Amino acid sequence: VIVTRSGAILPKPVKMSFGLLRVFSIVIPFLYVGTLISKNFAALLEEHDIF
């Protein structure tokens, strides 16, 4: 868990390089297209049965 069975201390767990950016720069622009796909879909949806 935190210390080895012998009593030693675990190594420094890894944090990937600037990952907090690596996740924003992929959630935001895909949060954005998830919007854009809807509005264009909303148009075609309005030219037909539902609304």
Partner: peptide, 22 residues
Amino acid sequence: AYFVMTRQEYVYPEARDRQYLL
């Protein structure tokens, strides 16, 4: 997203320790 950054799940005991070490 916390799992993709650090290869484990947001499980309270572990996720605490993996913070504790840092």
